[PDB]
Amino acid sequence: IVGGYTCGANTVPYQVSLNSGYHFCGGSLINSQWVVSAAHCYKSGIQVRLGEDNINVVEGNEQFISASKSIVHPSYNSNTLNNDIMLIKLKSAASLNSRVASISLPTSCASAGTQCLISGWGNTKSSGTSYPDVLKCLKAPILSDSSCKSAYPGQITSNMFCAGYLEGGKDSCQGDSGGPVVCSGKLQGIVSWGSGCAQKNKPGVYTKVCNYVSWIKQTIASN
Numbered sequence: 001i002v003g004g005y006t007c008g009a010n011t012v013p014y015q016v017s018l019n020s021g022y023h024f025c026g027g028s029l030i031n032s033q034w035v036v037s038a039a040h041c042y043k044s045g046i047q048v049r050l051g052e053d054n055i056n057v058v059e060g061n062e063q064f065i066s067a068s069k070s071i072v073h074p075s076y077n078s079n080t081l082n083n084d085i086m087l088i089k090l091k092s093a094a095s096l097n098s099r100v101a102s103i104s105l106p107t108s109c110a111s112a113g114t115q116c117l118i119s120g121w122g123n124t125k126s127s128g129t130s131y132p133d134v135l136k137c138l139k140a141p142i143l144s145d146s147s148c149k150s151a152y153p154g155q156i157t158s159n160m161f162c163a164g165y166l167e168g169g170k171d172s173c174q175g176d177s178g179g180p181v182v183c184s185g186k187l188q189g190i191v192s193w194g195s196g197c198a199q200k201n202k203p204g205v206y207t208k209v210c211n212y213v214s215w216i217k218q219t220i221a222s223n
C-alpha cells in the first residue's frame with residue numbers, strides 16, 4: 001500500500017496473509033472455513049494466517065491454518081486477469097473472535113464515489129521497494145468506469161472496477177494482491193492489478209466481487 005497509514009493491530013479482523021514460507025498475498029475471511037483471494041495469487045502449499053498485524057512477530061492473536069483446497073474461478077484468464085478470484089478452504093475452521101472476523105458479501109454492487117478501505121502488507125514505495133511488517137490501510141473511492149477505461153483502453157471488462165486517485169500517490173501494490181476492498185461494510189473488491197503502483201492516471205484495478213456472489217455461495221456449499 002503506497003501513501004496509506006498503519007491500520008492498527010487487528011482493526012481489519014477479516015484480513016488474511018497467505019504464506020508459503022513468507023507472505024506473498026492477502027485474502028479475506030468470508031466464514032470460518034473459507035477465504036477469498038485473487039486467482040493470480042494461486043500457489044500449491046498455502047498456509048492461511050489469521051489475526052495478524054506484524055507478520056514477522058507472533059504477537060499472540062494469530063491462527064495459522066493450512067488450506068485443504070483452492071478453487072480458481074473457472075473462467076480466470078491470466079493474460080487479461082479477467083475473473084481474478086479464487087476460494088481457499090481451511091483444513092480446520094477458524095475461531096472467530098474480536099481479532100478474527102469474517103466480512104460480508106455484497107447484496108448489490110457499489111457506486112462510483114463510494115469510499116472504501118483497502119489493506120495489505122504489500123510494497124509501500126512507488127519508485128522503490130519497502131515492505132512493511134504491520135498492516136497498512138488506505139481509504140480510496142471507486143472511480144467512474146470512464147476514467148477507469150480511459151486509463152486502460154481495451155483492458156477493462158465488466159468484472160473489474162478502478163479505485164484510487166488519478167493524481168497518483170495512493171494505491172494498493174504487489175503484496176496487497178488478493179486483499180480486501182471493503183465499502184459500506186461489504187467486500188466489494190479484490191486487489192488485482194494496475195500499472196506500477198501510485199502512478200498518476202494509472203489507478204488500481206480490482207475484481208468486482210458483486211458479480212461473483214452466486215458463484216461463491218454455490219461453490220462453498222458444494223465443497
Ligand SMILES: NC(=[NH2+])c1ccc2nc(C(=O)c3nc4ccc(C(N)=[NH2+])cc4[nH]3)[nH]c2c1
Nearest residue numbers: 172173174177192193194195196197204205
Ligand atoms: N506469486 C507470484 N509470483 C506473484 C503474486 C502476486 C503478484 N502480483 C504481481 C503484480 O505484478 C501486481 N500486483 C498488483 C496489485 C495491485 C497493483 C496496483 N498498482 N494497484 C499492481 C500490482 N502489480 N506479481 C505477482 C506475482
Ligand SMILES: [Ca+2]
Nearest residue numbers: 054057058059
Ligand atoms: Ca504476527
Ligand SMILES: [Mg+2]
Nearest residue numbers: 026120176179
Ligand atoms: Mg492485502
Ligand SMILES: [Zn+2]
Nearest residue numbers: 173174175177
Ligand atoms: Zn509482480
Ligand SMILES: [Zn+2]
Nearest residue numbers: 174193194196
Ligand atoms: Zn505489478
Ligand SMILES: [Zn+2]
Nearest residue numbers: 174175177192
Ligand atoms: Zn498482485
